[PDB]
């Protein structure tokens, strides 16, 4: 038998997907995890106790964005190795293609919390690796369920990207992406691209965006908006075809924007 219902904070969530808690949790009804240090444990009346005990309001590691009550916290998988350990789990229980659990070390991870008087809630998040060789800016990525379709997905793939920005370098998520996964990353994609040809070749949309070039000839495929010439990917849009497909109705959703300014954050 296996997790399949957890608690966390004021949320009852079922799992999606087998993921490896002990054997002895997962014969449990229901886990239940601290919301702040991520502890989880087999019995409400353990979960009752370590919330009047527990100190944390936040998630560990330092933050390195925070505008109004959004905020994101990155967390070296060496330094809090628990912590990323026990987020790996619960992410595992959402994504079926997530593999690793406990070597967290190669990773640093970003926490994105929703904060009010009682503490910095989690939302989600996505871990990276520290040195990707693939050049991966992103290896999982994932937004807790009662959170999804919500605008908090698009603000953690758009933030992936401004850390892209800021190391001066283009990256794409570690395939192979869920379901939702993809969806969101081809809307944040055109979104991204039909706003800046609203406002350039391939190459100079990559490096305004840090998109990679066959993410973004992939997406113009998607909305017919290259010619081939000679073995070349060029891009063929007139300035009212990009007003057409902004002003559709999937981008008419208010987004949390990443202010770079609100960004504290040092390339490595
Ligand atoms: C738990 C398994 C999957 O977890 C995820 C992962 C990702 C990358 C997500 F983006 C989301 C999500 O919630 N997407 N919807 S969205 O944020 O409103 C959005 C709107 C427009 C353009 C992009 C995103 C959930
Ligand atoms: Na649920
Ligand atoms: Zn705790």
């Not at 991870?109 to 008087?117: A, G, K, N, Q």
């Not at 081939?228 to 559709?248: A, D, F």
Request: glycine letters at 4%; aromatic letters at 14%; charged letters at 25%.
């Amino acid at each position: 038998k296996y997790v399949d219902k957890i608690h966390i904070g004021n949320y009852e969530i079922d799992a999606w997907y087998f993921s490896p808690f002990p054997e002895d949790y997962g014969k449990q009804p229901k886990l239940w995890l601290c919301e702040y240090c991520l502890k989880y444990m087999k019995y409400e009346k353990s979960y009752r106790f370590h919330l009047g005990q527990c100190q944390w309001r936040q998630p560990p590691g330092k933050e390195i964005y925070r505008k109004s009550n959004i905020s994101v916290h990155e967390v070296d998988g060496k330094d809090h190795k628990i912590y990323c350990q026990n987020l790996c789990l619960l992410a595992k229980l959402f994504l079926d293609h997530k593999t690793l659990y406990f070597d967290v070390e190669p990773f640093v991870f970003y926490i994105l919390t929703e904060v009010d008087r009682q503490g910095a809630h989690i939302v989600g998040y996505f871990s990276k690796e520290k040195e990707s060789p693939d050049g991966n800016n992103v290896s999982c990525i994932m937004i807790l369920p009662p959170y999804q379709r919500r605008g908090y997905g698009r603000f953690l793939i758009a933030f992936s990207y401004e850390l892209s920005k800021l190391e001066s370098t283009v990256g794409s998520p570690e395939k192979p992406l869920s379901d939702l996964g993809k969806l969101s990353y081809r809307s944040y994609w055109s979104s991204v691209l039909l706003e800046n040809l609203r406002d350039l070749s391939i190459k100079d949309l990559s490096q305004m965006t840090s998109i990679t070039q066959n993410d973004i000839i992939s997406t113009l495929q998607s909305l017919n908006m290259v010619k081939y010439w000679k073995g070349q990917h060029v891009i063929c849009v007139t300035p009212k075809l990009v007003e057409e497909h902004l002003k559709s109705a999937q981008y008419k959703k208010p987004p949390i924007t990443v202010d770079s300014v609100c960004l504290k954050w040092a390339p490595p």
